[PDB]
Amino acid sequence: WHYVEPKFLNKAFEVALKVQIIAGFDRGLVKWLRVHGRTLSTVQKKALYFVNRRYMQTHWANYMLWINKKIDALGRTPVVGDYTRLGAEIGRRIDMAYFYDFLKDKNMIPKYLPYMEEINRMRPADVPVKYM
């Protein structure tokens, strides 16, 4: 009986979060690009899609603190729908347009590099997140 390392969050729960967060961030980017799309190059716009994913990745630890505080407080068994909802909440409440405006105005939109293209091509479900 070979040991299995447990995941620190159920895969389906993680995927629900990442799919809803990235979907929400991307939707706000699309709305923002209604104005700024024509003022940015394709590689700048793709870099902003990558910024969404990297933002999720670096805020993941804080999100897990927030998520687990609410899940811990549930007087019942958690289910995937709880995480879909929490993920959708993060996805809509973060007004990423503030950040897009900052990066554009200060000329800090990342150079679009191969690793970013790698991250952008991934399914949101597969975007790597770190717990420990």
Side-chain angles (χ1 to χ4, degrees), residues 95-116:
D95 198 1
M96 289 291 290
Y98 283 101
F99 194 33
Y100 308 148
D101 284 333
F102 166 67
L103 293 178
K104 182 189 176 181
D105 294 344
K106 295 299 180 185
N107 303 319
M108 302 187 71
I109 299 179
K111 298 184 175 178
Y112 191 54
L113 305 170
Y115 161 78
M116 308 174 179

PDB file of all heavy atoms in Angstrom, residues 95-116:
ATOM      1  N   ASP A  95     -11.803  44.607  -8.734  1.00  0.00           N
ATOM      2  CA  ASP A  95     -11.959  45.475  -9.893  1.00  0.00           C
ATOM      3  C   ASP A  95     -10.606  45.659 -10.569  1.00  0.00           C
ATOM      4  O   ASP A  95      -9.928  46.665 -10.365  1.00  0.00           O
ATOM      5  CB  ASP A  95     -12.558  46.817  -9.477  1.00  0.00           C
ATOM      6  CG  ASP A  95     -13.146  47.588 -10.653  1.00  0.00           C
ATOM      7  OD1 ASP A  95     -13.111  47.076 -11.794  1.00  0.00           O
ATOM      8  OD2 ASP A  95     -13.652  48.705 -10.423  1.00  0.00           O
ATOM      9  N   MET A  96     -10.216  44.666 -11.368  1.00  0.00           N
ATOM     10  CA  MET A  96      -8.872  44.600 -11.910  1.00  0.00           C
ATOM     11  C   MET A  96      -8.558  45.763 -12.844  1.00  0.00           C
ATOM     12  O   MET A  96      -7.385  46.063 -13.091  1.00  0.00           O
ATOM     13  CB  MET A  96      -8.659  43.265 -12.641  1.00  0.00           C
ATOM     14  CG  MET A  96      -8.565  42.067 -11.694  1.00  0.00           C
ATOM     15  SD  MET A  96      -7.058  42.083 -10.689  1.00  0.00           S
ATOM     16  CE  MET A  96      -5.829  41.733 -11.923  1.00  0.00           C
ATOM     17  N   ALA A  97      -9.597  46.425 -13.346  1.00  0.00           N
ATOM     18  CA  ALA A  97      -9.412  47.579 -14.221  1.00  0.00           C
ATOM     19  C   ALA A  97      -8.516  48.650 -13.587  1.00  0.00           C
ATOM     20  O   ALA A  97      -7.789  49.343 -14.303  1.00  0.00           O
ATOM     21  CB  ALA A  97     -10.751  48.164 -14.594  1.00  0.00           C
ATOM     22  N   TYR A  98      -8.565  48.801 -12.259  1.00  0.00           N
ATOM     23  CA  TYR A  98      -7.659  49.732 -11.577  1.00  0.00           C
ATOM     24  C   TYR A  98      -6.212  49.380 -11.884  1.00  0.00           C
ATOM     25  O   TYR A  98      -5.365  50.252 -12.086  1.00  0.00           O
ATOM     26  CB  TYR A  98      -7.847  49.701 -10.059  1.00  0.00           C
ATOM     27  CG  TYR A  98      -9.048  50.433  -9.525  1.00  0.00           C
ATOM     28  CD1 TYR A  98     -10.188  49.743  -9.167  1.00  0.00           C
ATOM     29  CD2 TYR A  98      -9.028  51.810  -9.337  1.00  0.00           C
ATOM     30  CE1 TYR A  98     -11.288  50.389  -8.653  1.00  0.00           C
ATOM     31  CE2 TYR A  98     -10.137  52.479  -8.826  1.00  0.00           C
ATOM     32  CZ  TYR A  98     -11.265  51.759  -8.485  1.00  0.00           C
ATOM     33  OH  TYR A  98     -12.381  52.396  -7.978  1.00  0.00           O
ATOM     34  N   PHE A  99      -5.936  48.082 -11.878  1.00  0.00           N
ATOM     35  CA  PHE A  99      -4.590  47.569 -12.092  1.00  0.00           C
ATOM     36  C   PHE A  99      -4.187  47.709 -13.565  1.00  0.00           C
ATOM     37  O   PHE A  99      -3.052  48.098 -13.858  1.00  0.00           O
ATOM     38  CB  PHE A  99      -4.515  46.111 -11.630  1.00  0.00           C
ATOM     39  CG  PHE A  99      -3.120  45.571 -11.479  1.00  0.00           C
ATOM     40  CD1 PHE A  99      -2.062  46.375 -11.070  1.00  0.00           C
ATOM     41  CD2 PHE A  99      -2.870  44.238 -11.742  1.00  0.00           C
ATOM     42  CE1 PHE A  99      -0.784  45.842 -10.925  1.00  0.00           C
ATOM     43  CE2 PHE A  99      -1.601  43.713 -11.607  1.00  0.00           C
ATOM     44  CZ  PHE A  99      -0.560  44.516 -11.195  1.00  0.00           C
ATOM     45  N   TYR A 100      -5.108  47.410 -14.486  1.00  0.00           N
ATOM     46  CA  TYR A 100      -4.839  47.578 -15.912  1.00  0.00           C
ATOM     47  C   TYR A 100      -4.496  49.047 -16.207  1.00  0.00           C
ATOM     48  O   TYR A 100      -3.546  49.339 -16.938  1.00  0.00           O
ATOM     49  CB  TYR A 100      -6.037  47.134 -16.774  1.00  0.00           C
ATOM     50  CG  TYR A 100      -6.586  45.744 -16.486  1.00  0.00           C
ATOM     51  CD1 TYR A 100      -7.939  45.475 -16.652  1.00  0.00           C
ATOM     52  CD2 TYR A 100      -5.762  44.709 -16.056  1.00  0.00           C
ATOM     53  CE1 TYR A 100      -8.464  44.225 -16.390  1.00  0.00           C
ATOM     54  CE2 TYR A 100      -6.281  43.439 -15.796  1.00  0.00           C
ATOM     55  CZ  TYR A 100      -7.631  43.213 -15.964  1.00  0.00           C
ATOM     56  OH  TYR A 100      -8.169  41.980 -15.706  1.00  0.00           O
ATOM     57  N   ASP A 101      -5.273  49.970 -15.642  1.00  0.00           N
ATOM     58  CA  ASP A 101      -4.998  51.404 -15.804  1.00  0.00           C
ATOM     59  C   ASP A 101      -3.598  51.762 -15.304  1.00  0.00           C
ATOM     60  O   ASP A 101      -2.864  52.514 -15.958  1.00  0.00           O
ATOM     61  CB  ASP A 101      -6.041  52.238 -15.063  1.00  0.00           C
ATOM     62  CG  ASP A 101      -7.377  52.292 -15.780  1.00  0.00           C
ATOM     63  OD1 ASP A 101      -7.412  52.154 -17.024  1.00  0.00           O
ATOM     64  OD2 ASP A 101      -8.406  52.498 -15.095  1.00  0.00           O
ATOM     65  N   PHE A 102      -3.222  51.222 -14.150  1.00  0.00           N
ATOM     66  CA  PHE A 102      -1.895  51.464 -13.584  1.00  0.00           C
ATOM     67  C   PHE A 102      -0.785  50.963 -14.507  1.00  0.00           C
ATOM     68  O   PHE A 102       0.147  51.706 -14.831  1.00  0.00           O
ATOM     69  CB  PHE A 102      -1.768  50.794 -12.215  1.00  0.00           C
ATOM     70  CG  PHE A 102      -0.364  50.712 -11.706  1.00  0.00           C
ATOM     71  CD1 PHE A 102       0.334  51.857 -11.372  1.00  0.00           C
ATOM     72  CD2 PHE A 102       0.254  49.488 -11.546  1.00  0.00           C
ATOM     73  CE1 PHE A 102       1.617  51.777 -10.893  1.00  0.00           C
ATOM     74  CE2 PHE A 102       1.544  49.401 -11.065  1.00  0.00           C
ATOM     75  CZ  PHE A 102       2.226  50.546 -10.739  1.00  0.00           C
ATOM     76  N   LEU A 103      -0.887  49.707 -14.933  1.00  0.00           N
ATOM     77  CA  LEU A 103       0.149  49.106 -15.768  1.00  0.00           C
ATOM     78  C   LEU A 103       0.281  49.847 -17.087  1.00  0.00           C
ATOM     79  O   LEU A 103       1.392  50.105 -17.552  1.00  0.00           O
ATOM     80  CB  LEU A 103      -0.145  47.629 -16.026  1.00  0.00           C
ATOM     81  CG  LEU A 103      -0.059  46.706 -14.807  1.00  0.00           C
ATOM     82  CD1 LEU A 103      -0.432  45.298 -15.229  1.00  0.00           C
ATOM     83  CD2 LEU A 103       1.317  46.707 -14.136  1.00  0.00           C
ATOM     84  N   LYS A 104      -0.848  50.198 -17.687  1.00  0.00           N
ATOM     85  CA  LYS A 104      -0.822  50.936 -18.940  1.00  0.00           C
ATOM     86  C   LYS A 104      -0.187  52.311 -18.746  1.00  0.00           C
ATOM     87  O   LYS A 104       0.724  52.694 -19.483  1.00  0.00           O
ATOM     88  CB  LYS A 104      -2.232  51.093 -19.506  1.00  0.00           C
ATOM     89  CG  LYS A 104      -2.255  51.810 -20.855  1.00  0.00           C
ATOM     90  CD  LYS A 104      -3.649  52.154 -21.326  1.00  0.00           C
ATOM     91  CE  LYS A 104      -3.582  52.941 -22.627  1.00  0.00           C
ATOM     92  NZ  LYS A 104      -4.914  53.329 -23.148  1.00  0.00           N
ATOM     93  N   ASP A 105      -0.667  53.051 -17.752  1.00  0.00           N
ATOM     94  CA  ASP A 105      -0.225  54.435 -17.560  1.00  0.00           C
ATOM     95  C   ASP A 105       1.251  54.535 -17.170  1.00  0.00           C
ATOM     96  O   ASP A 105       1.945  55.459 -17.606  1.00  0.00           O
ATOM     97  CB  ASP A 105      -1.101  55.127 -16.513  1.00  0.00           C
ATOM     98  CG  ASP A 105      -2.542  55.292 -16.979  1.00  0.00           C
ATOM     99  OD1 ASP A 105      -2.794  55.150 -18.194  1.00  0.00           O
ATOM    100  OD2 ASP A 105      -3.424  55.564 -16.137  1.00  0.00           O
ATOM    101  N   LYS A 106       1.746  53.580 -16.386  1.00  0.00           N
ATOM    102  CA  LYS A 106       3.135  53.625 -15.921  1.00  0.00           C
ATOM    103  C   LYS A 106       4.074  52.816 -16.806  1.00  0.00           C
ATOM    104  O   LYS A 106       5.243  52.629 -16.469  1.00  0.00           O
ATOM    105  CB  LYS A 106       3.221  53.130 -14.477  1.00  0.00           C
ATOM    106  CG  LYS A 106       2.497  54.034 -13.492  1.00  0.00           C
ATOM    107  CD  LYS A 106       3.085  55.453 -13.471  1.00  0.00           C
ATOM    108  CE  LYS A 106       2.353  56.349 -12.494  1.00  0.00           C
ATOM    109  NZ  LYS A 106       2.835  57.755 -12.561  1.00  0.00           N
ATOM    110  N   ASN A 107       3.555  52.349 -17.940  1.00  0.00           N
ATOM    111  CA  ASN A 107       4.333  51.549 -18.880  1.00  0.00           C
ATOM    112  C   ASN A 107       4.946  50.322 -18.224  1.00  0.00           C
ATOM    113  O   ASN A 107       6.133  50.043 -18.398  1.00  0.00           O
ATOM    114  CB  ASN A 107       5.435  52.401 -19.517  1.00  0.00           C
ATOM    115  CG  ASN A 107       4.886  53.632 -20.212  1.00  0.00           C
ATOM    116  OD1 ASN A 107       3.851  53.572 -20.877  1.00  0.00           O
ATOM    117  ND2 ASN A 107       5.571  54.760 -20.055  1.00  0.00           N
ATOM    118  N   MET A 108       4.130  49.589 -17.473  1.00  0.00           N
ATOM    119  CA  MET A 108       4.598  48.401 -16.761  1.00  0.00           C
ATOM    120  C   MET A 108       3.878  47.123 -17.197  1.00  0.00           C
ATOM    121  O   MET A 108       3.992  46.087 -16.538  1.00  0.00           O
ATOM    122  CB  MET A 108       4.437  48.616 -15.250  1.00  0.00           C
ATOM    123  CG  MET A 108       5.190  49.849 -14.760  1.00  0.00           C
ATOM    124  SD  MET A 108       5.211  50.041 -12.969  1.00  0.00           S
ATOM    125  CE  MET A 108       6.309  48.701 -12.536  1.00  0.00           C
ATOM    126  N   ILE A 109       3.151  47.178 -18.309  1.00  0.00           N
ATOM    127  CA  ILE A 109       2.581  45.955 -18.859  1.00  0.00           C
ATOM    128  C   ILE A 109       3.761  45.049 -19.169  1.00  0.00           C
ATOM    129  O   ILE A 109       4.697  45.484 -19.842  1.00  0.00           O
ATOM    130  CB  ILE A 109       1.733  46.204 -20.128  1.00  0.00           C
ATOM    131  CG1 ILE A 109       0.549  47.122 -19.797  1.00  0.00           C
ATOM    132  CG2 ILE A 109       1.255  44.881 -20.703  1.00  0.00           C
ATOM    133  CD1 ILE A 109      -0.354  47.456 -20.973  1.00  0.00           C
ATOM    134  N   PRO A 110       3.754  43.810 -18.648  1.00  0.00           N
ATOM    135  CA  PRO A 110       4.932  42.958 -18.847  1.00  0.00           C
ATOM    136  C   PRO A 110       5.288  42.746 -20.309  1.00  0.00           C
ATOM    137  O   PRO A 110       4.385  42.694 -21.139  1.00  0.00           O
ATOM    138  CB  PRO A 110       4.515  41.624 -18.217  1.00  0.00           C
ATOM    139  CG  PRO A 110       3.519  41.997 -17.191  1.00  0.00           C
ATOM    140  CD  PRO A 110       2.781  43.189 -17.728  1.00  0.00           C
ATOM    141  N   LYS A 111       6.580  42.642 -20.618  1.00  0.00           N
ATOM    142  CA  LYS A 111       6.983  42.071 -21.892  1.00  0.00           C
ATOM    143  C   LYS A 111       6.383  40.689 -21.928  1.00  0.00           C
ATOM    144  O   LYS A 111       6.405  39.983 -20.926  1.00  0.00           O
ATOM    145  CB  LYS A 111       8.499  41.998 -22.042  1.00  0.00           C
ATOM    146  CG  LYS A 111       9.184  43.330 -22.011  1.00  0.00           C
ATOM    147  CD  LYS A 111      10.677  43.161 -22.264  1.00  0.00           C
ATOM    148  CE  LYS A 111      11.384  44.496 -22.353  1.00  0.00           C
ATOM    149  NZ  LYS A 111      12.856  44.331 -22.545  1.00  0.00           N
ATOM    150  N   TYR A 112       5.829  40.306 -23.069  1.00  0.00           N
ATOM    151  CA  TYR A 112       5.174  39.020 -23.186  1.00  0.00           C
ATOM    152  C   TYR A 112       6.202  37.943 -23.553  1.00  0.00           C
ATOM    153  O   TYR A 112       6.758  37.949 -24.653  1.00  0.00           O
ATOM    154  CB  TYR A 112       4.047  39.111 -24.212  1.00  0.00           C
ATOM    155  CG  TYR A 112       3.116  37.924 -24.232  1.00  0.00           C
ATOM    156  CD1 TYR A 112       2.480  37.489 -23.070  1.00  0.00           C
ATOM    157  CD2 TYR A 112       2.859  37.247 -25.414  1.00  0.00           C
ATOM    158  CE1 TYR A 112       1.626  36.406 -23.089  1.00  0.00           C
ATOM    159  CE2 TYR A 112       2.005  36.166 -25.445  1.00  0.00           C
ATOM    160  CZ  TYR A 112       1.390  35.747 -24.271  1.00  0.00           C
ATOM    161  OH  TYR A 112       0.535  34.674 -24.291  1.00  0.00           O
ATOM    162  N   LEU A 113       6.442  37.031 -22.609  1.00  0.00           N
ATOM    163  CA  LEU A 113       7.525  36.047 -22.683  1.00  0.00           C
ATOM    164  C   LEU A 113       6.981  34.624 -22.767  1.00  0.00           C
ATOM    165  O   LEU A 113       5.800  34.392 -22.495  1.00  0.00           O
ATOM    166  CB  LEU A 113       8.441  36.201 -21.459  1.00  0.00           C
ATOM    167  CG  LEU A 113       9.004  37.608 -21.255  1.00  0.00           C
ATOM    168  CD1 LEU A 113       9.688  37.738 -19.898  1.00  0.00           C
ATOM    169  CD2 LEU A 113       9.961  37.948 -22.385  1.00  0.00           C
ATOM    170  N   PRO A 114       7.837  33.654 -23.142  1.00  0.00           N
ATOM    171  CA  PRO A 114       7.361  32.286 -23.390  1.00  0.00           C
ATOM    172  C   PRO A 114       6.618  31.645 -22.210  1.00  0.00           C
ATOM    173  O   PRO A 114       5.631  30.944 -22.422  1.00  0.00           O
ATOM    174  CB  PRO A 114       8.650  31.523 -23.692  1.00  0.00           C
ATOM    175  CG  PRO A 114       9.590  32.583 -24.236  1.00  0.00           C
ATOM    176  CD  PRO A 114       9.267  33.818 -23.482  1.00  0.00           C
ATOM    177  N   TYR A 115       7.076  31.893 -20.991  1.00  0.00           N
ATOM    178  CA  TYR A 115       6.427  31.321 -19.816  1.00  0.00           C
ATOM    179  C   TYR A 115       4.998  31.854 -19.680  1.00  0.00           C
ATOM    180  O   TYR A 115       4.078  31.115 -19.320  1.00  0.00           O
ATOM    181  CB  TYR A 115       7.242  31.633 -18.565  1.00  0.00           C
ATOM    182  CG  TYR A 115       6.485  31.502 -17.261  1.00  0.00           C
ATOM    183  CD1 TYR A 115       6.245  30.256 -16.688  1.00  0.00           C
ATOM    184  CD2 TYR A 115       6.030  32.627 -16.592  1.00  0.00           C
ATOM    185  CE1 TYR A 115       5.561  30.139 -15.481  1.00  0.00           C
ATOM    186  CE2 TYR A 115       5.351  32.522 -15.392  1.00  0.00           C
ATOM    187  CZ  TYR A 115       5.116  31.279 -14.842  1.00  0.00           C
ATOM    188  OH  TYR A 115       4.442  31.194 -13.647  1.00  0.00           O
ATOM    189  N   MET A 116       4.813  33.134 -19.980  1.00  0.00           N
ATOM    190  CA  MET A 116       3.476  33.738 -19.941  1.00  0.00           C
ATOM    191  C   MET A 116       2.552  33.123 -20.979  1.00  0.00           C
ATOM    192  O   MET A 116       1.368  32.902 -20.718  1.00  0.00           O
ATOM    193  CB  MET A 116       3.564  35.242 -20.165  1.00  0.00           C
ATOM    194  CG  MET A 116       4.545  35.933 -19.245  1.00  0.00           C
ATOM    195  SD  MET A 116       4.759  37.674 -19.655  1.00  0.00           S
ATOM    196  CE  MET A 116       5.930  38.182 -18.409  1.00  0.00           C
TER     197      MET A 116
END
